[PDB]
Design a protein around this ligand. Structure first.
Ligand code: FAD
Ligand code: FAD
Ligand code: CO
Lengths: 379, 379
C-alpha cells in the first residue's frame, strides 16, 4: 500500500494551487456578487493547460486520471467552489463521450475542447424530474439520419456556454431505464434555446441554465452508444464524476479551516486570541477530522476508478460524507468569525452558500444513501 | 499511489479472520460474563503465530509492521474488542522496547514473548493522573546500578498476566517531563503487586490492573533509553499504538453493520422485512460511511508510521474518529434489533459496552483533540 503522490502529481498540484491563489481567489467575491461567468478565468485555465485536461493526449488533453482530478479539484474549489464547478461540469459532459463515444466522435467532440477555451455539458435533470433517470420526459424520436429531440432540461451547469451538450432522452417511456439514449447536441443547432437561471444561493459564478429543445434535429452520428444504453451511460458517468464533487467539498472545508484559524489567531476576546479557547480549538479540530478523513476516502475512491474496480458505492460515500463535513466546517468557520463572519466582507459566509449545493447536485445525499443502501442490502 | 494489499497481507488477513471466527467469537460472551482472561485463546494466538507478531524476526517474531497490525487488528476486534485488547496491549508493552531498547534488551525481553504464550504491559497512567502524563508521581530514585521504584499505576492492561511491564516514573518531579524515565519491571520482582480490577462495563475478557511498587529494585540494565527520555518514549509509543485502537474500532463497527444487516433482512414488521424501511436503511448506510472512511484513514496513518513520517496528528484523528463512529454504529445496531438487542443472547449490546472504552484509553478523545489542536495552531 502507498498513499504518496508522484513527482508529476505534486507538480500538477502546485500548478493547480498556484492558479487558484493567483487567478481564482482574487475574483471569487466579484463574480459571486455579479452572478456572471468569469470567462477570463476559463481562458486562463485553458492557457495553463488545466481546462478539460481529462481529455486523453490523443485529442490534445493531458489525459489526466481520476486521482489527478481529485488533486486539481481540491485546489481549485479551495479558492471557489462555484468557479470550480465550471471545469468540473465540463469534465462531466466529457465523461459520456469518453465512455461511449467512438474514436471518430472522441476526436470530433473533444478536439475543439483542447484547442481553445471551450466547455462541455451534461443534461440529465428536468423541471419535474432530477432524481430518476428512468422517468425522463425529454423525448428523442429516431427519424432517418437524425433524432427529433423535444423537451426541457433543468439546472444544467455550463448549459449556455458549452459547445455541445450530452442530452439524455427517452425513445420510449414504457421501456423506462431501457428507453434512454445519449445524444450530443451542438450549440448552434436550431430549436435549441438556453435560458440562464438566476438568484442562486451560491456557486453564483457557475452558469446554470434551463435548456429547451424544440424539434431539434440531432444526427445519429451524435448518439453515444446504442439506444437503450443511455441510462447505463448516465450512471457510469455519475459513479466517477461524484468523486470530484467530494474533492471540491474537501477543498471548501480546507478553505474554511484556513480562514477560521487565521482569524482565531488574530482575533482576541477577554484579553487573548480566541484560538486559545478550547471551544474554538475543538471546532477547528472537528474541521480537520472531516477534511483528512474525507480526502483520504476520496483518494481511495479515485484509486478504485483508476484501477477499473467497482466504485459506485465508494464515490457515493465520498460525495455524501465530504459535502456534509464541508457544510459543517463552513458553518463553524462563520461562527468563529462572529459578526464579521456574517458579511461578504469576509469569505466564510460564501463558503456555506457554495458548499450546500454539493449536497444536492449530481444526485442528492439521500439518493447517495439509497445507492449505498443497495450495495449493503444486495446479496 | 496504491491502496491494495500484498499477497502476504491477504494471507495474514485470512488467518486473523479465520481465527476470530473459529476461536474468539464462540467464547466472546462466555468470557465477557465471567470477566476472566481466556488463556486458551492466548495460546492459540501464539500457536498460530499472531501473538506479539510485531517482534522482529531476529527475536523469533514475524516483524509485522503497522499496516499489518491494522489488518490483523480489525479482524480480531471484529469477534471481540475485549479479547483483542490483550494482544493489542501486549504490542503496546513491546513498543517502548522496540523504539529504544538495545539489541541486548530486545533479545532478553522479547524472546520470551515469541517462544511461548506470554504478554507484555505498558504502565503510564496512575490513580490521580491519566491525561496529564507528564505529571507522574511514581518515583524512581537511582541508587547506583539500580533504581528504587515507588508508586502506583492504574488501569494497566495485562498488568498481572505480563512477564514484564514497562513502567514510566519520574527521577525528580521538579524536572516535570524532563524527569521521566522508562523502566522494565519483571512480573516477580520483590515489592511489586498486581491487583485485578473488576466490574468493567466492557472489554471484560481483558485483565486490567492496579500495580503497586514498594521499594522495588530495578537495575539500569532495565532502563529503556537515558533518564529524561521517558516522556519521548511514552509519546512516540502512543503516536503509533493509537492506530491499532482505531483498527479495533473499525472492527467493532463492522461487526455492528453485519449483525444489524443480517437481523434487518430477516426481521419482519408491518408485513415486510425491516430492511425495506428507509430509516433502517439509512442507519445501516451511516454505519458503512463511518466504517469505510475510518478504515482508509487508519490505513493512511499506518502508512505514515511505516514510512517513518509524522503521524501524531493522523493517529489521534483516526483513533478519535473511529471510536466515535463505532460507538454510534453499535448503538444503532442495538436499536435495529429492538428488544432483542437489549439482551445478552444477542451480540450487539456487548459491542456498545466494549467500544466505549476505545474513546477513553490510550488517550481520551478530548486529549486526542488537544493533540490535533496543537498540530493545527503550531506556528
Ligand atoms: C446549481 C445546480 C446545478 C445543477 N447542475 C446539473 C447539471 O449540470 N447536470 C445535471 O444532470 N443535473 C444538474 N443539477 C441537478 C442535480 O443533479 C439533481 O439531480 C437535482 O437537484 C434533483 O433535483 P430535483 O429538484 O429534480 O428533484 P427531487 O428529487 O424532487 O428532490 C427530492 C428531494 O426528495 C428526496 N428524495 C427524492 N427521491 C427520494 C427517494 N426515493 N427516497 C428518499 N428521498 C428521496 C431528495 O433527496 C431531495 O431532498 C443541478 C442542480 C443545481 C441546484
Ligand atoms: C479499561 C482501561 C484500560 C487501560 N489500560 C491502560 C494501560 O494499559 N496503560 C496506560 O498507561 N493507561 C491505561 N489506561 C488509561 C488511559 O490510557 C488514560 O490515561 C486514562 O483513561 C485517563 O483516565 P483518567 O480517569 O485517569 O483521567 P482524567 O484525565 O482525569 O479524565 C479526564 C476527563 O477530563 C477530560 N480532560 C482531561 N484533561 C483535559 C484537558 N486538558 N482539556 C479538556 N478535557 C480534558 C478527559 O478527556 C476526560 O474526559 C486504561 C483505561 C481503561 C479505562
Ligand atoms: Co437529417
Amino acid at each position: 500500500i502507498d498513499f504518496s503522490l508522484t513527482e508529476e502529481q505534486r507538480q500538477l498540484q502546485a500548478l493547480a494551487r498556484r492558479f487558484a491563489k493567483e487567478v481564482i481567489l482574487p475574483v471569487a467575491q466579484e463574480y459571486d456578487e455579479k452572478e456572471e461567468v468569469p470567462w477570463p478565468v476559463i481562458e486562463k485555465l485553458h492557457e495553463v493547460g488545466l481546462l478539460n485536461a481529462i481529455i486523453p493526449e490523443e485529442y490534445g488533453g493531458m489525459g489526466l486520471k481520476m486521482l489527478d482530478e481529485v488533486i486539481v479539484g481540491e485546489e481549485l474549489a479551495y479558492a471557489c467552489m462555484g468557479i470550480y464547478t465550471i471545469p468540473m461540469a465540463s469534465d462531466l459532459g466529457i465523461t459520456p463521450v469518453l465512455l461511449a463515444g467512438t474514436e471518430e466522435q472522441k476526436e470530433r467532440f473533444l478536439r475543439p475542447l483542447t484547442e481553445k477555451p471551450a466547455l462541455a455539458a451534461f443534461a440529465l435533470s428536468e423541471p419535474g424530474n432530477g432524481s430518476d433517470a428512468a422517468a425522463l420526459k425529454t423525448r428523442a424520436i429516431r427519424q432517418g439520419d437524425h433524432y427529433v429531440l423535444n423537451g426541457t432540461k433543468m439546472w444544467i451547469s455550463n448549459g449556455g456556454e458549452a459547445e455541445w451538450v450530452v442530452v439524455f432522452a427517452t425513445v420510449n417511456p414504457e421501456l423506462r431505464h431501457k428507453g434512454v439514449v445519449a445524444l450530443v447536441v451542438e450549440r448552434g443547432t436550431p430549436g435549441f434555446k438556453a435560458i440562464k437561471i438566476h438568484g442562486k444561493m451560491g456557486q453564483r459564478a457557475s452558469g446554470t441554465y434551463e435548456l429547451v429543445f424544440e424539434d431539434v434535429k440531432v444526427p445519429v452520428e451524435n448518439r453515444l452508444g446504442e439506444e437503450g444504453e443511455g441510462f447505463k451511460i448516465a450512471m457510469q458517468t455519475l459513479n466517477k464524476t461524484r468523486i470530484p464533487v467530494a474533492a471540491g467539498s474537501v477543498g471548501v472545508a480546507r478553505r474554511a479551516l484556513d480562514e477560521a484559524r487565521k482569524y482565531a489567531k488574530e482575533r482576541e476576546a477577554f484579553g487573548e486570541p480566541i484560538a486559545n479557547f478550547q471551544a474554538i480549538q475543538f471546532k477547528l479540530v472537528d474541521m480537520l477530522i472531516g477534511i483528512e478523513t474525507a480526502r483520504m476516502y476520496t483518494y481511495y475512491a479515485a484509486w478504485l476508478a483508476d484501477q477499473g474496480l467497482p466504485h459506485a458505492h465508494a464515490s457515493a460515500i465520498a460525495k455524501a460524507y465530504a459535502s456534509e463535513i464541508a457544510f459543517e466546517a463552513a458553518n463553524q468557520a462563520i461562527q468563529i468569525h462572529g459578526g464579521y463572519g456574517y458579511v461578504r466582507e469576509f469569505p466564510v459566509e460564501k463558503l456555506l452558500r457554495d458548499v450546500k449545493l454539493n449536497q444536492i447536485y449530481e444526485g442528492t445525499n439521500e439518493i447517495q444513501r439509497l445507492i449505498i443502501a443497495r450495495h449493503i442490502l444486495a446479496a
